[PDB]
Design a protein around this ligand. Structure first.
Ligand SMILES: Nc1nc2c(ncn2[C@@H]2O[C@H](COP(=O)(O)OP(=O)(O)OP(=O)(O)O)[C@@H](O)[C@H]2O)c(=O)[nH]1
Ligand SMILES: [Mg+2]
Lengths: 181, 1068, 326
DNA sequence: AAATTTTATCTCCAGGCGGTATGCACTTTTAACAGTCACCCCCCAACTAA
DNA sequence: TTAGTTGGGGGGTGACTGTTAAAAGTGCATACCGAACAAAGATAAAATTT
């Protein structure tokens, strides 16, 4: 919720502060290089950095940690119960969305076959928000054949996909993902 | 359709990407291990990448070249999991679990040498090298040292793969120089015969001259007591069965079929019910319900197996291999039978757990024997064995049944190993939960389909005992009503609970005997306990020959049922009952705002008790009718002390008068000169009227009332009815019929009698105490000396108690006057019997209260006061009676207490040689199983860390020792009677035999008692106890105290045991 | 250990509280364990009749002597109030008595349940057996047996602090709420009449008075305020569905519902009855996700009566006498 | 050390309470910054079998 | 039922390379609650108590 944004965030870890603070130097060194490589060299010198720098970063992090411990403790007290409901609903929705997103992605990574095409998807594709407006009125059909041609296309798509569906079940058994059947 | 084409090409690209990713880098079984040691990891990498023909065989020698308490619950469960995977042939899962546990540091700690050895053996049985080398890498990284079993597994693998002689010989000198011996390798316990054959082939590829040690003739026992039994010099006339060989083979085939089926079905003996409409409708509904329950059980089992498998694929232990052991149909049928056997009152959850696990192990064992091929070998060996016990067939040289069984060459009997207790309880819990959730039944049974809501058949309710609460599973009441209405005429028994149809398998070792295929235990105990078996195994092999031979002799006795008594008992049972005669009445005949409940509750309680008694009687009578025209045998085994008990519980000869009256010997014998007299004296003894009279007076009284005997034999239920006045009415009727048939025949001397005659011993415990103490005063009292009239202590105690009661009632006590003449030997018998065993006033009071409640004529309001008065007077009367008995009892109790203080349970050895141990210990902590419905609390027996229970160890040492001495006497008597051709079966202290052989049996009894008690039992016991416990060098003071206590034994008295031979009433 | 009263002002105040009814003067007072007999003298001072149910004979003759020339005000019956009507079934020893015989001796005639209160019992609960005495009194009250046969009898007794808090628990206090609280709040109206520390009474042991100052310091460690409570049985306790025949099923339902406290009502109704649990919850006006710890005693009685009033199913309960003693 | 208080009671034929809080040791999870860029999710409609 | 289909246009996570430490999860262990009523008694061990 917007009230969640109102709650303060935890202090950034020591390694990150070093990465953030030392970034503007590295835009001066080589700005065209890929950030991933640059992260490694800052880490490479975080590996070679002296212990005193780590000690001072850790002291600052501890102080900011105590500070944040204080503001968050004060802030979570003054809020209203309706905001409690808002935050709990939003976090539950966020976890559910994360779970769903992973499930859809695992499925799309496992090469699951597509569903059969539809009369309306074909109409939209022929048409090539704005489309939703145009296809709405265009849907009314004065041709019995328009539905019929679609059935033949539906029949053709269904047969190939079912052959893929019976095929796709085989490797999942071979790999070990028997539950997806 | 360009869209279809682009979709197809994208799917093809994604498939190729996934295939490449899987090939280069989901649930997949992990084979290659990850090792902590950097050098070993590099070695594994370079060996894998060395060459396609990588030197796995040479790496084997490279790894084997170096060779420089109680387990936890999780360790035991993992070991059982690995061995069950070995049996089930799901080795990839065992390997995956092993490598996964080898990954994490904490899980690495649990693994021991045995687990790696088992997985190596599994991989060797298939001959694989790569996986065996991987497991060797793991076992070497763990820091363990390979043992004999590892080298045996390697040799078996090399032999199976038909590898050349070089690697084999190399491993040979390595194992030879490391201090190991091939002879020890060929005697390992955990090695199947196929494994030894393959190892032999592999070894003979290198050294063909090597040969196993030759077989030797079995040794014979040489103990003093048992020398004559096994001596080959003398005249022997062993009994032989009357049946021919062909019938005995057919009977064996029938018993094998019954045990393979695992169930036997018998027709009910209840009154038949005409097929009304309601009965047919109920039967149709019940059949439909059974079909639906079967399908639901199948589906639930499949889903549970899938879930448990998925649990293992994450690296966690489960019960998947245990579920895979049996076929699904067998599990479904077992669950359905258990559901059908559930009583209406319900059963405890833990009891259902012990029961469902016990039935699974037996079927697993039978299936293992059936598949492994031992069944055909058993058939052949038993068919050749039966030539000894057939009347027509002959043996070249007669011998004991076990000796012949071993002489032919016994098949090498390999059975399975019991599961640990945690697995046993978890499996039962899972099965019970499956049964509970799977079954469902309609809400309205009588009305077909008014409502479609479905209610569970079984419920889970809590039963509260004092503060404690227990979980109970109770059937739905409508289901119970449906079962009652259907009234099916078929009963089901487990094959173990029904007497064998073929002669029992001889006892050759503590692991083989009794039933042909089903598992049986030589000493009965709770499931977890194993100390008794370990002591039995660690003893010399020739110690238990006497016990095994006695059990086999008792097992091979042919029985039969009495037709007339069975017919009469059916008439009373099916027609309103006769509870006076022990035949329970039908529940239809029943006695039947705060005042009404006080009557309804009593009526319901009486009805419940009558129903339970009728159910038990129904079981016994149905079994008895099913065996009407057949000959059956009853096997035997021992409790942990040595006393023998028949295995089949329902129908044996330890029951009430009905059970002991229905049975009779199958083989007969001419009465001869004294058979009729012995029959008359047995009838008088069964009557109970004359118990303090000499034999002459008993025979005279028998001759006086011959008319009553004849009348009762002719018209039992419609005559003068004299036989119902006896102490044991049903046995008396059978004896009367036997006597009438004998008398009315032409020549009574040639009559063939099938009826056993019982000879029993007076004051047996005090007869052994007086023999141990050699107390002349005690000996004369218990009929150890030649006397003209029987003498017993119990009547004297009763007389003294009555005199005290008379004197007290003179002064005006109400309780003294109320029980004016109800004082009898019966009330004081058990109390004065157990006073020397260590009974307290609490136990005596409870026993006296039980007898007074059982009087049924004593005013029941005064039971408490009467019990107190009687126990006080009895303990006052026994203040100075026994002296030597009490001295021996005190010595035994003090020794047991002092031994039990230092944390060691008491042990001793019987004069025959059977070792005995007391299993009493304190269980401080109790285990639990977290689960769905509830958490079962069980007791972990089989834990030696627990401290001994000093109360139980002192209390039971004096009673238990005397019981071991009695069993030894019975065994010696049976063994020395078998040589003379006698039929001998015993009940603890009562000996049964034919009418004509009673004199010979009495002579043998007296001689064997004298020979047994001629030996110095007490001194040998003291020496053994000193050598076992006192010799331990823990503390000098504790050992000194034990030595001073043990080394002082009571002095013997002045009594020669040879006079027992002339005692007429020693047994009578 | 007995704790008699030996303080004069305390005895006077207790006598005034016991005779706190200006109307209906003659309340026959049944007293337990009179001990020294100071509260007894105070009770006779105010004029009310007394009957002493002395549990020990060592101090009977002193009370008998004090009752001489009292014109029947003081009558001593050697009896123990907590041993009335033993269930053993044998002859009754003199420490115990049959309630019928005692009430015939005292000349008390039975009255209906809806009538007024015949008697009043004044005494103290057992020191270590309060949870036994409460259960026995509850069993006698619900079944209408023993002294409750003759009518509704008040029992005014002193109870300890912890047991008082456990007895007066409410859904507001979830930790102490249990079966005994439910049954004693459904069956009676409990009122707190007086408060008093432990040291006000003089402990009596088997040998005699506990006069050792060492245990007096230990008595401070054992000190707990003793509340005086009043229980008058409720007139509307028995309805058509809850009767002396059905009380066992109600007791078992209450014990089962508290067997697993952290569970909903439906999770227990599924294990107790074959009827539709959701229907019963709807009928008693409760949400499906209702805990057992959130139900007032009236809710429990309404639940039991609602299940019992169902006429659709012939079999509505799984409780049976076979469940008991197993 | 010596007393008081509390507990179980002759053996065998095979026996056991169930739930809720609290602590500790350990391994496994997630959020905290930095920029790049691709994928997934709409937005707003429209059908249909798994 | 519900979720997955196609059109441009819009935006929001996570892919990434990288450390750090608090928060969650896992598995065993001990303790206290229920002291469901239902008379009473004798004796000798087992445990705390001071
Ligand atoms: N410890 C113990 N042993 C028992 C008990 N009942 C029987 N026994 C043993 O079993 C033996 C045989 O008992 P019975 O045959 O009933 O009677 P008995 O002592 O032989 O005496 P009689 O009645 O004269 O034959 C006894 O001597 C005891 O050794 C019992 O309750 N406790
Ligand atoms: Mg006997």
């Amino acid at each position: 919720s917007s009230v969640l944004a109102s709650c303060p965030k935890k202090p950034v870890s020591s390694y990150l502060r070093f990465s953030k603070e030392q970034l503007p130097i590295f835009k001066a060194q080589n700005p065209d290089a890929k950030t991933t490589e640059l992260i490694r060299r800052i880490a490479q010198r975080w590996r070679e950095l002296p212990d005193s720098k780590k000690k001072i970063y850790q002291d600052a992090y501890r102080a900011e940690w105590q500070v944040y411990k204080e503001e968050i403790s004060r802030f979570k007290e003054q809020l209203t119960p309706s905001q409690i409901m808002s935050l709990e609903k939003e976090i539950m929705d966020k976890h559910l969305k994360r779970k769903a997103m992973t499930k859809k992605k695992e499925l799309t990574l496992l090469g699951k076959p597509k569903r059969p095409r539809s009369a309306y998807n074909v109409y939209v594709a022929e048409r090539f928000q704005e489309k939703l407006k145009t296809v709405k009125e265009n849907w009314k059909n004065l041709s019995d054949s328009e539905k019929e041609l679609y059935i033949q296309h539906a029949k053709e798509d269904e047969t190939r996909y079912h052959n893929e569906m019976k095929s796709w079940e085989e490797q999942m058994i071979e790999v070990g993902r028997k539950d997806l059947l | 359709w360009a869209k279809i084409l682009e979709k197809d090409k994208r799917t093809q690209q994604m498939r190729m990407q996934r295939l490449k990713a899987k090939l280069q880098m989901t649930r997949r079984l992990q084979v290659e291990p990850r090792l902590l040691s950097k050098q070993m990891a590099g070695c594994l990498e370079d060996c894998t990448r060395q060459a396609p023909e990588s030197p796995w065989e040479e790496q084997l020698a490279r790894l084997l070249q170096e060779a420089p308490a109680q387990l936890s619950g999780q360790q035991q469960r993992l070991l059982a999991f690995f061995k069950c995977c070995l049996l089930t042939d799901q080795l990839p899962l065992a390997h995956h679990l092993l490598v996964v546990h080898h990954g994490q540091r904490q899980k690495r700690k649990l693994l021991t040498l045995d687990m790696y050895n088992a997985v190596m053996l599994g991989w060797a049985r298939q001959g694989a090298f790569k996986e065996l080398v991987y497991v060797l890498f793991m076992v070497k990284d763990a820091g363990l040292t390979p043992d004999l079993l590892s080298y045996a597994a390697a040799l078996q693998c090399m032999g199976r793969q038909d590898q050349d002689a070089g690697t084999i010989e190399r491993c040979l000198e390595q194992m030879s120089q490391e201090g190991l011996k091939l002879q020890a390798l060929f005697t390992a316990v955990l090695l199947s015969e196929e494994d030894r054959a393959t190892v032999l082939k592999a070894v003979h590829k290198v050294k063909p001259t090597f040969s196993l040690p030759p077989q030797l003739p079995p040794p014979v026992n040489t103990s003093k007591l048992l020398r004559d039994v096994y001596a080959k010099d003398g005249r022997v006339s062993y009994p032989k069965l009357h049946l021919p060989l062909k019938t005995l083979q057919c009977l064996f085939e029938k018993q094998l079929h019954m045990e393979l089926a695992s169930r036997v079905c018998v027709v009910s003996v209840e009154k038949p019910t005409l097929p009304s409409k309601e009965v047919k409708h109920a039967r149709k509904t019940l059949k439909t319900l059974r079909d639906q329950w079967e399908k639901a059980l199948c589906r639930a089992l499949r889903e549970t197996k899938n879930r448990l498998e998925r649990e293992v694929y994450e690296g966690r232990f489960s019960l998947y291999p245990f579920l895979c052991l049996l076929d699904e149909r067998e599990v479904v049928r077992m669950l359905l039978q258990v559901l059908q056997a559930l009583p209406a009152q319900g059963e405890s959850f833990t009891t259902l757990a012990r029961e469902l696990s016990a039935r699974t192990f037996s079927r697993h064992v039978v299936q293992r024997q059936r598949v492994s091929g031992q069944v055909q070998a058993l058939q052949n060996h038993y068919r050749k064995y039966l030539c000894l016990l057939a009347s027509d067939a002959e043996v070249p040289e007669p011998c004991l049944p076990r000796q012949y069984w071993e002489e032919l060459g016994a098949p090498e009997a390999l059975r399975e190993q019991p599961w640990p207790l945690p697995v046993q309880m978890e499996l039962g819990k899972l099965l019970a939960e499956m049964l509970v959730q799977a079954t469902q039944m309609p809400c309205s049974l009588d009305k077909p389909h008014r409502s479609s809501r479905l209610v569970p058949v079984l419920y889970h309710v809590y039963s509260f005992r004092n503060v404690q609460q227990i979980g109970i599973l109770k059937p739905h009441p409508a289901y119970v009503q449906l079962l009652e209405k259907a009234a099916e005429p078929t009963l089901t028994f487990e094959a173990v609970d029904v007497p064998m149809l073929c002669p029992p398998l001889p006892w050759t070792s503590p692991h083989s005997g009794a039933f042909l295929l089903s598992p049986t235990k030589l000493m009965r105990t709770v499931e977890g306990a194993t100390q008794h078996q370990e002591l039995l195994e660690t003893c010399p092999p020739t110690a238990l020959h006497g016990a095994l031979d006695a059990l086999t002799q008792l097992g091979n006795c042919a029985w039969r049922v009495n037709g007339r008594v069975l017919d009469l008992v059916l008439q009373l049972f099916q027609a309103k009952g006769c509870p006076q005669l022990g035949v329970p009445a039908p529940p239809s005949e029943a006695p039947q705002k705060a005042e009404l409940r006080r009557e309804l509750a009593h009526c319901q309680k009486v009805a419940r008790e009558m129903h339970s008694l009728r159910a038990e009687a129904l079981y016994r009578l149905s079994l008895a009718q099913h065996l009407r025209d057949r000959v059956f045998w009853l096997p035997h085994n021992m409790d942990f002390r040595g006393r023998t008990y028949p295995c089949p519980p329902h129908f044996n000869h330890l029951g009430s008068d009905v059970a002991r009256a229905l049975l009779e010997f199958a083989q007969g014998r001419p009465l001869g000169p004294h058979g009729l007299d012995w029959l008359k004296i047995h009838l008088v003894n069964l009557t109970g009227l004359k118990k303090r009279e000499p034999l002459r007076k008993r025979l005279a009284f028998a001759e006086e009332v011959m008319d009553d005997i004849l009348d009762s034999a002719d018209q039992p239920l419609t005559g003068r009815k004299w036989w119902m006045g006896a102490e044991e009415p049903w046995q008396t009727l059978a004896c009367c019929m036997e006597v009438a048939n004998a008398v009315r025949a032409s020549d009574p001397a040639a009559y063939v009698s099938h009826l056993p005659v019982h000879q029993d011993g007076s004051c047996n415990g005090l007869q052994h105490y007086a023999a141990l103490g050699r107390d002349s005063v005690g000996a004369a009292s218990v009929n150890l000396e030649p006397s003209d009239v029987p003498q017993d202590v119990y009547s004297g105690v009763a007389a003294q108690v009555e005199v005290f009661r008379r004197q007290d009632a003179q002064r005006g006590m109400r309780v003294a006057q109320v029980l004016e003449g109800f004082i009898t030997r019966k009330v004081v018998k058990q109390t004065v019997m157990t006073v020397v065993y260590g009974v307290t006033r609490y136990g005596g009071r409870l026993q006296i209260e039980k007898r007074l409640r059982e009087l049924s004529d004593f005013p029941q309001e005064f039971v408490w006061e009467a019990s107190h008065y009687l126990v006080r007077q009895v303990f006052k009367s026994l203040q100075e009676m026994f002296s030597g008995t009490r001295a021996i009892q005190h010595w035994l109790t003090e020794s047991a207490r002092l031994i039990s203080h230092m944390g060691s349970v008491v042990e001793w050895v019987t004069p025959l040689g059977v070792p005995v141990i007391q299993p009493y210990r304190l269980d401080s902590k109790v285990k639990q199983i977290g689960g769905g419905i509830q958490s079962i609390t069980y007791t972990h027996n089989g834990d030696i860390s627990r401290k001994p229970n000093t109360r139980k160890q002192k209390n039971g040492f004096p009673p238990n020792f005397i019981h071991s001495l009695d069993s030894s006497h019975m065994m010696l008597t049976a063994l020395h009677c078998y040589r003379k051709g006698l039929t001998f079966v015993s009940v603890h202290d009562c000996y049964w035999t034919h009418a004509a052989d009673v004199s010979v049996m009495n002579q043998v009894c007296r001689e064997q008692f004298v020979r047994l008690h001629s030996e110095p039992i007490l001194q040998d016991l003291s020496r053994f106890l000193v050598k076992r416990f006192c010799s331990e060098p823990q503390k000098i003071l504790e050992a000194s105290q034990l030595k001073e206590t043990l080394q002082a034994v009571p002095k013997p008295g002045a009594f020669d045991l040879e006079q027992v031979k002339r005692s007429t009433y020693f047994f009578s | 250990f007995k704790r008699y009263v030996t303080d004069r002002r305390l005895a006077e105040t207790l006598a005034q509280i016991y005779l706190g009814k200006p109307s209906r003067p003659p309340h026959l007072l049944l007293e337990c364990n009179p001990g020294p007999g100071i509260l007894t003298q105070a009770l006779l001072e105010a004029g009310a009749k007394v009957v002493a149910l002395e549990s020990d004979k060592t101090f009977i003759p002193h009370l008998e002597s004090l009752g001489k020339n009292l014109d029947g005000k003081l009558r001593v019956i050697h009896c123990d109030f907590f041993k009335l009507d033993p269930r053993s079934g044998g002859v009754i020893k003199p420490p115990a008595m049959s309630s019928r015989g005692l009430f015939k001796n005292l000349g008390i005639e039975a009255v209906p349940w809806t009538a007024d209160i015949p008697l009043k019992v004044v005494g103290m609960f057992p020191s270590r057996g309060e949870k036994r005495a409460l259960w026995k009194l509850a069993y006698d009250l619900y079944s209408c047996t023993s002294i409750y046969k003759f009518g509704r009898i008040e029992v005014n007794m002193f109870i300890g602090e912890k047991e008082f808090q456990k007895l007066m628990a409410d859904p507001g206090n979830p930790d102490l709420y249990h079966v005994l609280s439910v049954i004693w709040q459904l069956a009676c109206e409990i009122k707190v009449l007086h408060m008093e520390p432990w040291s006000s009474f003089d402990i009596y042991t088997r040998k005699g008075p506990l006069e050792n100052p060492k245990r007096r310091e230990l008595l401070d460690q054992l000190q707990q305020k003793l509340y005086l409570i009043q229980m008058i049985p409720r007139q509307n306790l028995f309805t058509k569905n809850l009767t002396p025949m059905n009380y066992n099923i109600f007791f078992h339902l209450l014990k089962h519902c508290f067997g697993r406290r952290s569970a909903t009502v439906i999770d227990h109704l599924r294990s107790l009855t074959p009827l539709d649990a959701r229907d019963i919850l709807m009928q008693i006006g409760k949400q499906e996700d209702e805990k057992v710890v959130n139900m007032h005693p009236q809710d429990f009685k309404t639940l039991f009566e609602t299940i019992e009033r169902s006429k659709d199913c012939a079999y509505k309960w799984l409780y049976d006498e076979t469940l008991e003693d197993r």
